[PDB]
Amino acid sequence: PYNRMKLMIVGNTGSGKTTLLQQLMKTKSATVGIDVKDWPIQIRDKRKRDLVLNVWDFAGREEFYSTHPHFMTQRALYLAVYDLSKGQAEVDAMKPWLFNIKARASSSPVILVGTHLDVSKACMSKITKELLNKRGFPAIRDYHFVNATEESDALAKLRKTIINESLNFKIRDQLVVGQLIPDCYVELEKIILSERKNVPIEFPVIDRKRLLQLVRENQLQLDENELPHAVHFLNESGVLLHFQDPALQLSDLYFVEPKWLCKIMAQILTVPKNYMTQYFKLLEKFQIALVPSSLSDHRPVIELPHCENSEIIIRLYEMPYFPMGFWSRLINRLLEISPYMLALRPNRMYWRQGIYLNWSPEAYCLVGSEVLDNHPESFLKITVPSCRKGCILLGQVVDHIDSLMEEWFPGLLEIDGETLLKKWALYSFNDGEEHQKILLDDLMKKAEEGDLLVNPDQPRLTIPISQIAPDLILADLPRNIMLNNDELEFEQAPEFLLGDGSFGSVYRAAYEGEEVAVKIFNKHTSLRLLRQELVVLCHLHHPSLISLLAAGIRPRMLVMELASKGSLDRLLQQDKASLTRTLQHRIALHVADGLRYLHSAMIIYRDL
């Protein structure tokens, strides 16, 4: 049984965390980094389950907030300390943290702790019991008004509550604190803990060769192919940190004693000649490098070339707060990776909450927070010109944002249903001259894909859904590709017209008087996969790669040329006599030319 779990001590600046921690572990200066430790709790009950929590005393100061979401995981318990002294407003000051615990670790407990009980205002439990309980917040499970700097019945009850609430974790009835692991994992952990002492203090990092030498020098029977799983599991438990990603040159270095790494990386936000390049690589991996923090926080006046509601495309993104390192990861992601063409470097004007790439007066793109009146929520208005290049940019930007949310902040998309993230689309029936763009939730417009227009109570007015949300109707791509549904003669339901058995869901249809093979990509999934495939296919154009004929949203389908003689596999099976030396050579030559063109475009055709 693995008796080890992470305890995370979240909070705001100045509120007692390290002092509370010093009195919780009975271990009788501003935090910089996250200050990892670990205390072993010898439970004296009949179930003497000796557990080891490893605490993460998060620093409250704002400048470190970019790196915190990297160290917030699910299999961890949270504290949240909030300084009772400035009552009734220090509770409303830690709602960002709780929202962030909700976004990163949506199903982890939270034990609210009110410090500074000596001074004063204990009726802050009112707002805690009314506004902070269930309205989009991470499942609070106890709340204590404790003192620090001295042990009493308050801290005793708080410590006992941490113990109890730890043991009864049960993510989907799992009991995190007592699950089972291969014995080799705990053996590896013990040898790593011993290696913590025998390593230079100035540099605690260990080498992959040194790890291999260590696991071989003792009887640990972990095979070479098993080491990634083990080291990643020890990573999840907060023993050692490592980054197996090959995009970085760090996978040969296994960070033991992680508190040193975290402190050292956060050192430059307040201000080994071999690893300078690796230093910079992982500095970017922590989102420290151009320092994305300290970017003046002040929107510079920007007079766009195009006013007029019929010449720009707006999209909002509503959420109660921006997650901690949201804008940093977004700016980094949007860094010239969204070009209008498929080249030219654009002008860029960054601040702390915006980017504004700008090629031309008709090929710009401005992402950036915009605050509205009588709305405490936060918004991410995106402005883009109505032209073709504009539509392309809007597609790329929306996909990047959506990807980031699904990858880092899943709790902002979990359906209960306000969903905590409502993507709007601003349309203006008002002829472009008049104003006050009517805002329509994006999902409602997605359900309005049956037609190709939006129409008000007075149906004399209309707007095409292309000039509102060209990522839904397939307009963001180059080379407008809709399939003119009057000319298609497809019949989906019959297996009569399957392109062939075991080609996926590829069928046979006749489009514009010629036989074509139509893949039905329609499913419960969104337009993510279809638009991805269409983007890839829309610019290849080689005689040895299948050509794209059209694409349709009703239903989600692809239209490609029909290979009359079927796949090569059937020829090898059925008519072997048809293949002659000249034909075999021609097939090999054509496939080789195809692969050559793909590699000339830096694309890897995974399996062939």
Q: Considering the rule CB under 6 A, would residue 33 count as an interface residue with ligand GDP? A: no
Q: Is 60 annotated among the ligand-binding residues?
A: no
Strands 4-11 and 76-81: parallel
Rounded CA Rg of the chain: 29
The only residue of 88, 120, 133, 149 in contact with ligand GDP, by rule CB under 6 A: 149
Closer to ligand GDP by CB, 79 or 261: give it.
79
Q: Is 393 helix (H, G, I), strand (E, B) or coil?
A: helix
Q: Please give the size of the binding site for its own copies, defined by CB under 8 A.
A: 24
Instruction: Say whether 607 is catalytic.
Output: yes
Burial of 134 (0-12, 13-18, 19+ CB in 10 A): exposed
Contact characters 474-503, ligand GDP, x per CB under 6 A: ------------------------------
Strands 110-114 and 140-145: parallel
Name 581's Cβ contacts closer than 8 Å, sequence gap at least 6: none
Q: Is 95 annotated among the ligand-binding residues?
A: no
Judged by beta carbon distances under 5 to 8 A according to partner kind, the member of ligand GDP, its own copies, none in contact with residue 200 is none
The only residue of 298, 479, 524, 565 in contact with its own copies, by rule CB under 8 A: 298
Q: Is 124 annotated among the ligand-binding residues?
A: no
Q: Considering the rule CB under 6 A, would residue 30 count as an interface residue with ligand GDP? A: yes
Closer to its own copies by CB, 344 or 589: give it.
344
Closer to its own copies by CB, 290 or 583: give it.
290
Burial of 458 (0-12, 13-18, 19+ CB in 10 A): exposed
Closer to its own copies by CB, 251 or 360: give it.
360
Q: Considering the rule CB under 6 A, would residue 155 count as an interface residue with ligand GDP? A: no
CB 198 within 8 A of CB 109: no
CB 384 within 8 A of CB 334: no
Stretch that binds its own copies, among 184-192, 289-297, 468-476, 584-592 (CB under 8 A): 289-297
* φ and ψ at residue 113, rounded to 5 degrees: -130, 125
Q: Is 560 annotated among the ligand-binding residues?
A: yes
Query: b/e for 171-204, b at 16 or more Cβ within 10 A?
Result: eeeeebbeeeeeeebebbbeebeebeeeeeeeeb
Torsion, Cα of 180, 185, 186, 192 (10° steps): -150
Closer to its own copies by CB, 255 or 359: give it.
359
Supply the DSSP string of 237-286, one letter for each residue: TTSEE----TTSS-TTEEEESHHHHHHHHTTTTT--TTTHHHHHHHHHHT
Q: Considering the rule CB under 8 A, would residue 492 count as an interface residue with its own copies? A: no
d(CA 428, CA 437): 4
- Of residues 511, 544, 548, the one with CA closest to residue 530: 548
The only residue of 67, 108, 115, 237 in contact with ligand GDP, by rule CB under 6 A: 115
Closer to ligand GDP by CB, 34 or 537: give it.
34
Question: Which residues are paired to 114 by β-bridges?
Answer: 145
Q: Is 362 annotated among the ligand-binding residues?
A: no
Judged by beta carbon distances under 5 to 8 A according to partner kind, the member of ligand GDP, its own copies, none in contact with residue 99 is none
Q: Is 33 annotated among the ligand-binding residues?
A: no
Angle subtended at Cα 171 by Cα 168 and Cα 173, rounded to the nearest 5 degrees:
75
CB 52 to ligand GDP: min, Å: 23
Closer to ligand GDP by CB, 158 or 477: give it.
158
DSSP character for 319?
Answer: B
- Of residues 18, 150, 163, 189, the one with CA closest to residue 77: 163
The only residue of 2, 8, 24, 31 in contact with ligand GDP, by rule CB under 6 A: 31
Judged by beta carbon distances under 5 to 8 A according to partner kind, the member of ligand GDP, its own copies, none in contact with residue 278 is none
Q: Is 128 annotated among the ligand-binding residues?
A: no
CB 34 to ligand GDP: min, Å: 10
CB 166 to ligand GDP: min, Å: 22
The only residue of 36, 55, 59, 366 in contact with ligand GDP, by rule CB under 6 A: 59
> Residue numbers of the site for ligand GDP (CB under 6 A)?
13-19, 30-31, 59-60, 115-116, 118, 147-149
| Residues making contact with its own copies (CB under 8 A) | 290, 295-296, 298, 300-306, 344-351, 358-361, 364
Q: Which residues are marked as active site? A: 607
